[PDB]
RNA sequence: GGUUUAGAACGUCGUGAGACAGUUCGGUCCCUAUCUGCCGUGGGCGCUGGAGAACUGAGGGGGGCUGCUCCUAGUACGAGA
């Protein structure tokens, strides 16, 4: 919090997706040291991407860490996802703000169950674009074996409804690029080119009023409570009235500084991850799931009608009927919440793979409007996508 | 230290002397090694003329224990941990 962030080069939210222990987090560490050395940005290291006791004694990542690497054309902002089966909830917050992912499948193991589960969550939430990266390569010195894995990833993406064959598959070791190998340094410089070429300039909404979902709350020693997250729409000026709506109730507030990776800002525009500092709020009372809206724009609701599209076995979901009293998890912008289902009259049962409308009473109120997209999940897997129809409360 | 002598007391049994795998406090542990054995250390003669060395090695005898940490490799094995 000292240097002013100059608004030059378009902002893009990138992040690594893939299987457990697959060079997902190590790729992010390779991207920093490669781009910092040649172009001449800020250095950083692989340690700062994941410290704590939880990501050292174990080794695995839980928290969605963030990184800022700059290139001549654009200014990227990384989101390193966790990857494991237990950490799907805090991943979806990292994956929702991500515009164009970098998928991570490896040349020794290949596509494994989580890779299918990750890309499934990317479609229903919001992941337009995706780039493959083979994160081992050197361990198996062979031309025939390494290229057989490329075929199966093209099959996976195309089977699940992505381009597949059009996606630029890249090969390169992360640990070799970390030290200083001229061939492998240049091969991950090539990935920075593939991010620039394939992913276009993202479409933001800097017109309709301010909204910002809170991904992770902080308490800065000196300033007060800081909320992070991508600004979904509108803008944020310093010393402007902001209403925090969602779980519990609703509180008034005012912004006292917006920032971009420990650098000051005047206007926090849409489509970019920013840390908003709120005035006169405690760490405990403000929680994860609430949204920073402009006063009057949005209202918290505990009941709503919604056109729910339930999935079948082929698309990946439930395979049995259910009656009123069923309680699955509804993932709106960031957080999840449980809610009882009340079906319409003249509908005895809800079969899998069917379009119907239904009233859903949530246990916690969340800020919502008509035409909001969500993805229902239960039992460590997906259930059904849909849209909000009418407000009731 | 315990149990097992003489003192004393408690509970208990006995009219009592006393008694109790009931308890409680106090209460002499000798031996200079002949033989066998064993550990060492010599004298004597023998080994075929004597003497000084150096050995071979039949046959004994000691010795023989394991831990972590790193590397292999977060590799194989596992959705994962
Ligand atoms: N040979 C090789 N090993 C790698 C590479 N990248 C990572 N590793 C190994 O895997 C670990 C790196 O963590 P990754 O699993 O790649 O990334 P991650 O985000 O921690 O993975 P998740 O647990 O899924 O979050 C290190 O301990 C490395 O030993 C690579 O490019 N080549
Ligand atoms: N926009 C934030 C992203 C972030 C969130 C949480 C921790 C670190 C970084 C910067 O800084
Ligand atoms: C003078 S009481 C003696 C007790 C006896 N001692 C040795 O045999 C026991 O047995
Ligand atoms: Mg990860
Ligand atoms: Mg006060
Ligand atoms: Mg005694
Ligand atoms: Mg005694
Ligand atoms: Mg007596
Ligand atoms: Mg007796
Ligand atoms: Mg007795
Ligand atoms: Mg005693
Ligand atoms: Mg005495
Ligand atoms: Mg004595
Ligand atoms: Mg004698
Ligand atoms: Mg003797
Ligand atoms: Mg002897
Ligand atoms: Mg003789
Ligand atoms: Mg002789
Ligand atoms: Mg002879
Ligand atoms: Mg011998
Ligand atoms: Mg003999
Ligand atoms: Mg022996
Ligand atoms: Mg040993
Ligand atoms: Mg190691
Ligand atoms: Mg190891
Ligand atoms: Mg591991």
Swiss-Prot record:
* G2, as annotated region: 59-63
- Which residues does the record give as Mg(2+) binding sites? 25
Cellular component aspect of the GO annotation = cytosol
Provide the residue positions that the database annotates as binding GTP. 18-25, 80-84, 135-138
Query: According to the UniProt entry, what is the EC number of this protein?
Result: 3.6.5.3
Q: Which Pfam families match?
A: GTP_EFTU, GTP_EFTU_D2, GTP_EFTU_D3
Catalytic activity as recorded in UniProt:
GTP + H2O = GDP + phosphate + H(+)
The segment annotated G4 runs over: 135-138
Provide the protein's localization: Cytoplasm
Q: Where is this region: G1?
A: 18-25
Record domain tr-type G: where = 9-203
| Region feature (G5) | 173-175
* Keywords recorded for this protein, A-Z: Cytoplasm, Elongation factor, GTP-binding, Hydrolase, Magnesium, Metal-binding, Nucleotide-binding, Protein biosynthesis
Q: Per its record, what are the GO molecular function terms?
A: GTP binding; GTPase activity; guanosine tetraphosphate binding; translation elongation factor activity
KW Protease (keyword) present: no
Major enzyme class: hydrolase
Family, according to the entry, reads as follows: Belongs to the TRAFAC class translation factor GTPase superfamily. Classic translation factor GTPase family. EF-Tu/EF-1A subfamily.
Function field: GTP hydrolase that promotes the GTP-dependent binding of aminoacyl-tRNA to the A-site of ribosomes during protein biosynthesis.
Known partners and oligomeric status: Monomer.
| Name of the protein in question | Elongation factor Tu 2
Task: Give the species.
Answer: Escherichia coli O139:H28 (strain E24377A / ETEC)
């Amino acid at each position: 919090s000292k240097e002013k962030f100059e608004r030059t080069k378009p902002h893009v939210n990138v992040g690594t997706i893939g299987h457990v222990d697959h060079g997902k987090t190590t790729l992010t560490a390779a991207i920093t040291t490669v781009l910092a050395k040649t172009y001449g940005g800020a250095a950083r290291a692989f340690n700062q991407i994941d410290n704590a006791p939880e990501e050292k004694a174990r080794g695995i990542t839980i928290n969605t860490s963030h990184v800022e690497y700059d290139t001549p054309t654009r200014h990227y902002a990384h989101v390193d996802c966790p990857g494991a089966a237990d950490y799907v909830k805090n991943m979806i917050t990292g994956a929702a703000q991500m515009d164009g992912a970098i998928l991570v499948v490896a040349a020794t193991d290949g596509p494994m169950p989580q890779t299918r589960e990750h890309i499934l969550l990317g479609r229903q939430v919001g992941v337009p674009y995706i780039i493959v990266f083979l994160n081992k390569c050197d361990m198996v010195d062979d031309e025939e074996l390494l290229e057989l894995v490329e075929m199966e990833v093209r099959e996976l993406l195309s089977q699940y409804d992505f381009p597949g064959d059009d996606t630029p598959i890249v090969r390169g070791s992360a640990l070799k690029a970390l030290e200083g190998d001229a061939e492998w340094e240049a091969k991950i410089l090539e990935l920075a080119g593939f991010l620039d070429s394939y992913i276009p300039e993202p479409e933001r909404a800097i017109d309709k009023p301010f909204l910002l979902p809170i991904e992770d709350v902080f308490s800065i020693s000196g300033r007060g409570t800081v909320v992070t997250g991508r600004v979904e729409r509108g803008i944020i000026k310093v010393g402007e009235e902001v209403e925090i709506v969602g779980i519990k109730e609703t509180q008034k507030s005012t912004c006292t500084g917006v920032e971009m990776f420990r650098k000051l800002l005047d206007e926090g525009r849409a489509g970019e991850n920013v840390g908003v500092l709120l005035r006169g709020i405690k760490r405990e009372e403000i929680e994860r799931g609430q949204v920073l809206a402009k006063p009057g724009t949005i209202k918290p609701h505990t009941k709503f009608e919604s056109e729910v599209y339930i999935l079948s076995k082929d698309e990946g979901g439930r395979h049995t009927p259910f009656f009123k009293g069923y309680r699955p998890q509804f993932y709106f912008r960031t957080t999840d919440v449980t809610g009882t289902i009340e079906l319409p009259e003249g509908v005895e049962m809800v079969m899998p793979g069917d379009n119907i409308k239904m009233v859903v009473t949530l246990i916690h109120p969340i800020a919502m409007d008509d035409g909001l997209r969500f993805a229902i999940r239960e039992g460590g897997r997906t259930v059904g996508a849909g849209v909000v129809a009418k407000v009731l409360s």
